[PDB]
Design a protein around this ligand. Structure first.
Ligand code: 1N7
Ligand code: MG
Lengths: 66, 552, 1316
DNA sequence: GCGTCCTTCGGAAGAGATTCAGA
DNA sequence: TCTGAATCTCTTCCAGCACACATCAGGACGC
RNA sequence: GAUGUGUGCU
């Protein structure tokens, strides 16, 4: 379901900002998860250009530079 | 933060830290005093409880509270929940260069313009004013320019008109359901305090004008202005992202104007006359020589791009009205004439705009939308389509149907005491016969309302579609439906109880006659449930969209 | 007949149904409840007396010392209401109580006492309630709304449906006391009864059964009736009750006296039961194997060794029955455990219960209530005695016991406040019976199960809490006290009681700020029935049922007035005639119906008594005697509407208006509106602002009189007389001699309330409506308050509307207001607002109020005086200086941005210790002069009246009027007269004169001391200056303007006079609405009001035309009589033949602007009457007229509606909502812009707007939205410099709210960090 | 006046802990 | 008497923006 | 700054 399919994403920041922050942060801290700032909510939170629209070109350049 | 007086703010993290440090210092003191193991064990337990309260208060059985039994917020209480650092200060932030005021119509605008108050754009575009004043040398430093602006001299208005010339602003309504709730308009300075808004985009904003406010935001950087103009400008948001239907569709007054203009009755000031063009039709109507609802044969030239993008004209002589001929004058070259030669409701106008967008493009569509709005407002004002109390005509065969239905109800009630029918099927059939009477009354009403208008052909009488204003704005699709007209002129219906039991005696009175002291109380159950459903059940529908956005 | 306030402008009434009960005092709940709380009760049941006798007399820990209450007294308030509002202190009264500490002699508990010490001791400080039911707490006026909470008693709910996830509906029995813990009984899906004290955890009801000192055999005796088995020769015959075998399967061949009755396995029919009863037999046979599934009732022990063979609640097995057969126990007891009727629930609970004795049951209860503590016998015993059987820790009130006894069908109504064995046993028996099938649950939305706690009851509870808090210390301190030195004040602390009462009245969920912007708002705020607050439910856990309107709200609670939003249906308003029962429930008036005559005596039936009688309908036709003309009338018997005969009825409704509230009874043609639109109309009528010149509504309801008079904003005359002197700020009434008392007669003075600030920053300003030398009668309006016209609630103006689309300037719901409306200042209102400039003493020194400000020239300091305070009457605009305050190194008070004003009041409060500033002492001197002058003037006027009374005594019994004038004024009381009672009256009047002299002298001294006082303030402030601006907010495009039928709108264009449409007479149209707002939202009442107002204005225009050209009284009288006799059959029936041929002329002069029409709520004016009234003038019967366009000058090619609709002006003004923010102030914990318009704050870019920005793909716009004009600090300043550098470029960093998040996560045990 | 200090009451769903029963 | 299936218990969630007003910040005890 | 109340538009 759309709740579990959002809680069980790869980037723990999205799941932490969506719902059940304690249960997500605890599991991420135990497992030592490593975020990648892949989607849109993570970049919105951090304060970067989203890899969605006019920032998609910038994100593509950033990914292809490494 | 120190307030007025010697006391301090009711901080909760500091209070929890005070408790934890106090307990820790007490435990350290008791470790050296060689206290009995029971006392130091109890103090260690209290320290553990205090730390568990500091980390996530309330996760244990009972939460601690500071004053008046209000559970104070720990570290987790300001990271989780709706009032945490994620959903309140990171995913959504308070924003500079923003404004807020009530909105009005101002239909003189264009699709790409809004009206900012002259005393608000001065506050929004203030650093731009400082920069241009320093560029022109009228000021010397930021302080001098700031003082000059706040003093509102005679030239700061002449500078504000240069920073705002082609600098779009973002008008956002409060519930931003879909992406069309934020659009960009080129400002037009007006005297006043209300943000004027183009009437077409009200459908997208879902913004009436009964006291709601909109927020205006200023794109600062160059890229923001170019995104506001190329992506978020209202002229680039004529198509709904949900479906291929147009979203800037005339609503409830342009529709009524174009429905009154593009409609014919079988009589006229001048009927059989033959016209030589739409311009001559407008000249004929504005001169008072022929009514707007004549039945004439005007000679028109409808272009067509049936070739590979080439406009080839074809002129003919079609049997139309004067109003349709007037309206055709604003249709762009490229549309067939079998698009205004009817009674334009709201679906007709929406399909007209859709076909214009698919055929001509975007710029002719915007021009066509503006012209449609103008010519709808003008010929709706020139019609005086009021609503009186004689327009809601109750059908004469209403109390007869009521008497027949009540006689049947009395017969079934008497049969109930005879034992033939129990409190089951009898209730079912009495509800069904009341519904039968309801549909018969509504059908009689809607047959007396529209086709029952005898007009003279000048040879004899015949019928037509009614000019009854209630029916006019119900048929045009401006505002209303079958339910509202049924509840105004027919009977109201069967208002059930909140549990689900349909009331045995349906309301036989409408809002053209009175309502009894008891029928109103019956209707209040449904009205209160319909009002409460919105208030306390839009929360789940607004949580569904949040889940859908976060999953995708 | 009519009085002078009625024979001045008499409103035509269209009500057909005659009235029998006049609308009562509308705010009769607040005043009556606080009168009950505050009065002196000898017996003591209400308010303080009951609260004192509940706690007092108080005794120590057997210390031979008692403190006993005797009597209480309320001292006079320190300041009056006006001085409290001006100053900012509560309007309260001291609480003086004659406490008495008594100590008996040593070794003599009941002997003679050592001494009697008593003194009136000041404890607590109870706020008093003003004349209008409003308190004053800190100058601001509060209103304590009533509360609608579930009554104490027992409520057998159901918990239907969703429990158990299988469809089995449980049953629960909650015992709610007024004060104390709960006693929730409830069932289990396995048919087990679980007691639940305070919702802690489930446990079998056998635990509390044993806790009540009961054995198992006693439990089985209580809940089950025994079935007798007798051991005999053999075969174990059974004692049989014939009724028991009803509805089951015959387990064997049912026989008696040889013959066979029911065969094997046959379901026993009632015919067989009746025939067995008629057989008159009691004993039959039964197979032994059948008793394998039975239970024993009582314990059974051996007769030889005493060993137990069958304990109580044990099964009968074949081996066990065989053992019992040889034992010698011939009579066997078993239970009537039917599987459908008499379910064996409590036996199963006994089986589940692990406890066996009372002591262990008490231990288990102690462990449940207070876990983790060592249970002892005495501690558990005391806990269980304090739970449900102690008069201090548990108290069902009188209403609680009434509901408890009525729900159990008992006979007595009174009883003890604590529970008992029989109470809990009866509750459990009733619950079991409901489970069985007999009886039914009771819904908790029924208005017979919801009480009303007004101000008096809540204040009594809160005071009792403080009294308990004080008496605990009075008990502890008394045992450790030195006698002969403890007068009854050293042990009672006044801090707790005063603190608790102030905590209630000041900061509570029901001590709401008074919504005060017109008389309707306050009069509907006082009559407000809330459900939130203490002891009620929150809007989070508020179900779909509490919001919904119950059928029992008819006549008690308004159905169509509840505030929309988060709390809809929880804040219902009281009905018009609704009253408060003695217990607190809601009851409504009803006309008693005899055999065939609808009588006049009126009975107030509650919500539980109504559900038994058959009550007729208000709109039922009668014929001069009280008889129903038709045989079948519509009625409501048991919450259900049906047709009933003319003989089954026994009650009839009083009037049609009794269903709706006061606020919703002002809407004309309410029955033609939708209910949502009626709700919106009521709310917006509550939100209306008072305009400059109040204008009467042409179409009304007749309820405006009651709302105006009974609100308290208008000065209503106390005793009838003649206006001796009418002034713009004072009215003097010379009372008629029949209304004068013998002693202390004089006259009465009404001091009007001039321009002063309301709670919502509006203006309340009473102005006279009577002329000089005009005879007034008792109980009539003397001066109209805000938004009133001759004692008639007038919230708006009669605007000449026309429903037509006009060039799109009324596109969606907008209004197009003509410029004549703003030229005439019909909607321009006043907004007095106060601006304070406090002067604290921070570090480096205090702050001064000097007029010299550094770095500011004299141009800005021109308005101020030499003392730094602005002159009264300055035309100060936005940005000027009001008070010049300097901070030790400028922080002077400045008028806010974009607001004009005119200072009309400056009040300076200086804390004691500072001598003064010269402006403050000038204000003090002016106040001293005014307080001397007004008192001297009132004394002069009332003594002129007193000397007139002296002379009127002198004219009887030897008057010498020839020598009367020449006498000097002093020597008039002792002129020539006989020694009859006339000389007694003269001496009494002289005594009154001398006493008034002394009283005026001491009052003047007290006034001197009060004005010259020290005016204590907050800790750490020197002086406070309050400046009262006064703006005239004109009408402008943007502010909401609304009608009464829920048709609001925002003005989009102030169109010039010439552009407005005009009729053939050239008269313009003041407002152009939108027609399309009528059919979709079916508020058809606006169009009917438009037509009726058009008819009324036509009548007014005919009167004005016949009055402009001078015409005699004959034509005017004839036309006005024709106008007032228009209806088919109305109860108005006013005849002008009794008017004195000048009163008709004044009436015509008052009617020339339009005849006011009364259209009662559900007794309204029919369309035929409207059309006939229109035809009475020269207006078309269809209502619509021909309108010509104002610009093109050509006719609109359709007749359009033109009439006079009553437009309000809601105070959602555009200038209070316009706001913008550039780079300004930012928050502290996270570097974000502040929130709100008060501080310079920016609009929140919410979580939903970020999604809309992501959808477009606008990344740079979003990036600037959440970094550069937001949390970022360095990037923000760099962006500001770039913007004022000619460069539109951003260099964002990272929002500071993310660093805050990182630090707050790292403050836990987590370690989150960025990776390179 | 300053100043130092140790109630209860929703409901829907889901997860994760206990208990049943049955082969 | 091991182990799926059912049941009991504890946790999480319940819209968006805005405006107005008020109250609070330790109060109990020593001096 | 946090609570409490009232209110506006959905
Ligand atoms: C005797 C009188 C009725 C006259 C017959 C009974 C019936 C209802 C009783 C009141 C209610 O319980 C509410 C309230 C409970 C609190 O405890 C404070 C007292 C209150 C006022 C009670 C006093 C008294 O007991 C009342 C008036
Ligand atoms: Mg709206």
């Amino acid at each position: 379901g759309i709740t579990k399919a959002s809680l069980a994403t790869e980037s723990f920041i999205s799941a932490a900002s969506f719902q059940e922050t304690t249960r997500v942060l605890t599991e991420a801290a135990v497992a030592g998860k490593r975020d990648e700032l892949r989607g849109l909510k993570e970049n919105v939170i951090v304060g970067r250009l989203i890899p969605a629209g006019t920032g998609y070109a910038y994100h593509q350049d950033r990914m292809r530079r490494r | 933060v120190p307030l007025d007086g010697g006391r301090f703010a009711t901080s909760d993290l500091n209070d929890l830290y005070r408790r934890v440090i106090n307990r820790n210092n007490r435990l350290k003191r008791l470790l050296d005093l060689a206290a009995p193991d029971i006392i130091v064990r109890n103090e260690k337990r209290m320290l553990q409880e205090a730390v568990d309260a500091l980390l996530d208060n309330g996760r244990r059985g009972r939460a601690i509270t500071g004053s008046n039994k209000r559970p104070l917020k720990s570290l987790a209480d300001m990271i989780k929940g709706k009032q945490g650092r994620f959903r309140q200060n990171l995913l959504g932030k308070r924003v500079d260069y923003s404004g807020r005021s009530v909105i009005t119509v101002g239909p003189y605008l264009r699709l790409h313009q809004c009206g900012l108050p002259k005393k608000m754009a001065l506050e929004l575009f203030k650093p731009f004013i400082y920069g241009k004043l320093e560029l022109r040398g009228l000021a010397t430093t930021i302080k001098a320019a700031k003082k000059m602006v706040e003093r509102e001299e005679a030239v700061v208005w002449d500078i504000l008109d240069e920073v705002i010339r082609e600098h779009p602003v973002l008008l956002n309504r409060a519930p931003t359901l879909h992406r069309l709730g934020i659009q960009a308009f080129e400002p037009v300075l007006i005297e006043g305090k209300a943000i004027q808004l183009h009437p077409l985009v009200c459908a997208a904003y879902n913004a009436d004008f009964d006291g709601d406010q909109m927020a205006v935001h200023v794109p600062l950087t160059l890229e923001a202005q170019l995104e506001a103009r190329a992506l978020m400008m209202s002229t680039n948001n004529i198509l709904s992202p949900a479906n291929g239907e147009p979203i800037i569709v005339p609503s409830q007054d342009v529709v009524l104007g174009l429905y009154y203009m593009t409609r014919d009755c079988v009589n006229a000031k001048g009927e059989g006359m033959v016209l030589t063009g739409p311009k001559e039709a407008e000249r004929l109507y504005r001169s008072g020589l022929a009514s707007l609802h004549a039945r004439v044969k005007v000679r028109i030239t409808e272009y067509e791009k049936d070739a590979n993008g080439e406009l080839v004209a074809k002129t003919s002589l079609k049997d139309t009205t004067v109003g349709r001929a007037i309206l055709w004058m604003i249709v762009p070259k490229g549309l067939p004439y079998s698009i205004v030669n009817q009674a334009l409701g709201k679906k007709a106008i929406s399909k007209m705009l859709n076909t214009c967008y698919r055929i001509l493009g975007l710029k002719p569509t915007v021009i066509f939308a503006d012209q449609i709005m103008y010519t709808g407002f003008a010929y709706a004002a020139r019609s005086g389509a009021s609503v009186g109390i004689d327009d809601m005509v109750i059908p004469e065969k209403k109390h007869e149907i009521i008497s027949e239905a009540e006689a049947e109800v009395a017969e079934i009630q008497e049969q109930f005491q005879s034992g033939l029918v129990t409190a089951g099927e009898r209730y079912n059939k009495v509800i069904d016969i009341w519904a039968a009477a309801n549909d018969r009354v509504s059908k009689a009403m809607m047959d007396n309302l529209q086709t029952e208008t005898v007009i003279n052909r000048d040879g004899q009488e015949e019928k037509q579609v009614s000019f009854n204003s209630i029916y006019m704005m119900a048929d045009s699709g401006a505002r209303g439906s079958a339910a509202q007209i049924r509840q105004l002129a027919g009977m109201r219906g069967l208002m059930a109880k909140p549990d689900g039991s349909i009331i045995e005696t349906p309301i036989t009175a409408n809002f053209r006659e009175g309502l009894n002291v008891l029928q109103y109380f019956i209707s209040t159950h449904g009205a209160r449930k319909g009002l409460a459903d919105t208030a306390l059940k839009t929360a789940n529908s607004g949580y569904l969209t949040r889940r859908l956005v976060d999953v995708a | 007949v009519y009085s002078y306030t009625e024979k001045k402008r008499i409103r035509k009434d269209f009500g057909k149904r005659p009235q029998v009960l006049d609308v009562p005092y509308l705010l009769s709940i607040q005043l009556d409840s606080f009168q009950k709380f505050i009065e002196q009760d000898p017996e003591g049941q209400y308010g303080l007396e009951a609260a004192f006798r509940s706690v007092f007399p108080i005794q120590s820990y057997s210390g031979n010392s008692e403190l006993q209450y005797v009597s209480y007294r309320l001292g006079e308030p320190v300041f009056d209401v006006q001085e409290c509002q001006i100053r900012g202190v509560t309007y309260s009264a001291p609480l003086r109580v004659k406490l008495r500490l008594v100590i008996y002699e040593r070794e003599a508990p009941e002997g003679t006492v050592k001494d009697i010490k008593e003194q009136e001791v000041y404890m607590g400080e109870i706020p008093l309630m003003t004349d209008n039911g409003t308190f004053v707490i800190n100058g601001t006026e509060r209103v304590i709304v009533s509360q609608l909470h579930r009554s104490p008693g027992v409520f057998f709910d159901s918990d239907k449906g969703k429990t158990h996830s299988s469809g089995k509906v449980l049953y629960n029995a909650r015992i709610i006391p007024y004060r104390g813990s709960w006693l929730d009984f409830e069932f289990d899906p396995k048919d087990n009864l679980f007691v639940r004290i305070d919702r802690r955890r489930k446990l079998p009801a056998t635990i509390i059964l044993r806790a009540l000192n009961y054995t198992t055999e006693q439990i089985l005796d209580l809940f089950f009736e025994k079935v007798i088995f007798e051991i005999r020769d053999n075969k174990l015959q059974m004692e049989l009750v014939p009724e028991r075998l009803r509805g089951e399967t015959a387990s064997f061949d049912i026989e008696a006296n040889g013959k066979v009755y029911v065969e094997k396995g046959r379901r026993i029919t009632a015919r067989h039961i009746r025939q067995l009863e008629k057989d008159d037999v009691k004993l039959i046979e039964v197979p032994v194997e059948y008793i394998a599934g039975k239970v024993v009732a009582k314990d059974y022990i051996d007769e030889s060794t005493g060993e137990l063979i069958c304990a109580a609640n044990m099964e009968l097995s074949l081996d066990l029955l065989a053992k019992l057969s040889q034992s010698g126990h011939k009579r066997i007891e078993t239970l009537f455990t039917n599987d459908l009727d008499h379910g064996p629930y409590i036996s199963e609970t006994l089986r589940v219960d692990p406890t066996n004795d009372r002591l262990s049951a008490l231990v288990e209860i102690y462990r449940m209530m207070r876990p983790g503590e060592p249970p002892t016998r005495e501690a558990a015993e005391s806990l269980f005695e304090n739970l449900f059987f102690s008069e201090d820790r548990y108290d069902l009130s009188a209403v609680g016991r009434m509901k408890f006894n009525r729900s159990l069908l008992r006979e007595e109504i009174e009883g003890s406040g604590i529970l008992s064995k029989d109470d809990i046993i009866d509750v459990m028996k009733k619950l079991i019976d409901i489970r069985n099938g007999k009886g039914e649950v009771d819904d908790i939305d029924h208005l017979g199960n919801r009480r009303i706690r007004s101000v008096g009851e809540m204040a009594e509870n809160q005071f009792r809490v403080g009294l308990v808090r004080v008496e605990r210390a009075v008990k502890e301190r008394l045992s450790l006290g030195d006698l002969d030195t403890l007068m009854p004040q050293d042990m009672i602390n006044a801090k707790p009681i005063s603190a608790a009462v102030k905590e209630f009245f000041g900061s509570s969920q029901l001590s709401q700020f008074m919504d005060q912007n017109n008389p309707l708002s306050e009069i509907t705020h006082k009559r407000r029935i809330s459900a939130l607050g203490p002891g009620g439910l929150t809007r989070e856990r508020a179900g779909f049922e509490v919001r919904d309107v119950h059928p029992t709200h008819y006549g008690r609670v308004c159905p169509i007035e509840t505030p929309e939003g988060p709390n809809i249906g929880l804040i219902n308003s009281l009905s018009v005639y609704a009253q408060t029962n003695e217990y607190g429930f809601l009851e409504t008036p009803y006309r008693k119906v005899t055999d065939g005559v609808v009588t006049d005596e009126i009975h107030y039936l509650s919500a539980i008594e109504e559900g038994n009688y058959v009550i007729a309908q208000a709109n039922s036709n009668l014929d001069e005697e009280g008889h129903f003309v038709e045989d079948l009338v519509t009625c409501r018997s048991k919450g259900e509407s049906s047709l009933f005969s003319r003989d089954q009825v026994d009650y009839m409704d009083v009037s049609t208006q009794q269903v709706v509230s006061v606020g919703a009874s002002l809407i004309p043609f309410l029955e033609h509106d939708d209910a949502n639109r009626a709700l919106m109309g009521a709310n917006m009528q509550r939100q209306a602002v008072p305009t400059l010149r109040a204008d009467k509504p042409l179409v009304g309801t007749g309820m405006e009189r009651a709302v105006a008079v009974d609100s308290g904003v208008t000065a209503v005359a106390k005793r009838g007389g003649v206006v001796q002197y009418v002034d713009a700020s004072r009215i003097v009434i010379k009372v008629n001699e029949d209304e004068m008392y013998p002693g202390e007669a004089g006259i009465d003075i009404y001091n009007l309330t001039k321009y002063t600030r309301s709670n919502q920053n509006t203006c309340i300003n009473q102005m006279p409506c009577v002329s000089l030398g005009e005879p007034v009668e008792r109980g009539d309006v003397l001066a109209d308050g805000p938004s009133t016209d001759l004692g008639e609630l007038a919230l708006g103006q009669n605007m000449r509307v026309a429903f037509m689309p006009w060039n799109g300037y009324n596109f969606e719901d907008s209004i197009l207001v003509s410029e004549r409306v703003v030229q005439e200042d019909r909607f321009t209102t006043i907004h007095i607002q106060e601006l304070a400039c406090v002067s604290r003493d921070t570090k480096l020194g205090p702050e001064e109020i000097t007029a010299d400000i550094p770095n500011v020239g004299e141009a800005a300091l021109s308005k101020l005086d030499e003392s730094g305070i602005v002159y009264i009457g300055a035309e100060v605009t936005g940005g000027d200086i009001l008070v010049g305050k300097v901070t030790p190194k400028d922080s002077s008070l400045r008028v806010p941005n974009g607001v004009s004003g005119t200072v009309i009041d400056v009040q300076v409060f200086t804390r004691d210790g500072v001598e003064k500033d010269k402006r403050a002492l000038e204000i003090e001197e002016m106040q001293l002069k005014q307080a001397k002058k007004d008192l001297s003037e009132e004394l002069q006027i009332l003594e002129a009246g007193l000397f007139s009374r002296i002379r009127a005594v002198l004219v009887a019994g030897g008057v010498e009027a020839e020598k009367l004038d020449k006498l000097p004024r002093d020597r008039w009381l002792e002129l020539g007269l006989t020694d009859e009672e006339k000389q007694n009256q003269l001496e009494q009047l002289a005594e009154q004169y001398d006493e008034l002299k002394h009283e005026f002298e001491k009052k003047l001294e007290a006034k001197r001391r009060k004005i010259t006082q020290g005016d204590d303030l907050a800790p750490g402030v020197l002086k406070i200056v309050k400046v009262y601006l006064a703006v005239k907010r004109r009408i402008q495009p943007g502010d909401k303007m609304a009608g009464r039928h829920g048709n609001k709108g925002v003005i989009s264009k102030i169109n010039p006079i010439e552009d407005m449409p005009y009729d053939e007479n050239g008269t313009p149209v003041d407002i152009v609405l939108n027609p399309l707002g009528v059919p979709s939202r079916m508020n058809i009442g606006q169009i009917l009001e438009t037509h009726l107002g058009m008819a009324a204005k036509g009548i007014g225009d005919k009167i004005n035309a016949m009055l402009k050209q001078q015409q005699e009284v004959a034509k005017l009288r004839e036309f006005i009589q024709r106008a007032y006799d228009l209806g088919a059959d109305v109860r108005q029936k006013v005849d002008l033949s009794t008017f004195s041929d000048e009163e008709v002329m004044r009436l015509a002069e008052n009617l020339r602007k339009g005849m006011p029409i009364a259209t009662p709520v559900f007794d309204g004016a029919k369309e035929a009457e409207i059309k006939e009234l229109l035809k009475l003038g020269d207006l078309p019967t269809s209502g619509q007229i021909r309108l010509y366009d104002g610009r093109t000058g050509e006719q609109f090619e359709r007749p359009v509606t033109v009439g006079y609709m009553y437009m309000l002006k809601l105070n959602h003004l555009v200038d209070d909502k316009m706001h913008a923010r550039s780079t300004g102030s930012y928050s502290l914990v996270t570097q974000q812009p502040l929130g709100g318009k008060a501080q310079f704050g920016g609009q929140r870019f919410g979580e939903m707007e970020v999604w809309a920005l992501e959808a477009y793909g606008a990344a740079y716009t979003l990036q600037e939205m959440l970094t550069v004009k937001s949390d970022d600090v360095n990037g923000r300043t760099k962006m500001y410099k770039n913007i004022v550098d000619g460069n539109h470029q951003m260099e964002p960093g990272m929002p500071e709210s993310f660093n805050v998040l990182l630090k707050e996560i790292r403050s836990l045990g987590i370690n989150i960090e960025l990776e390179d």
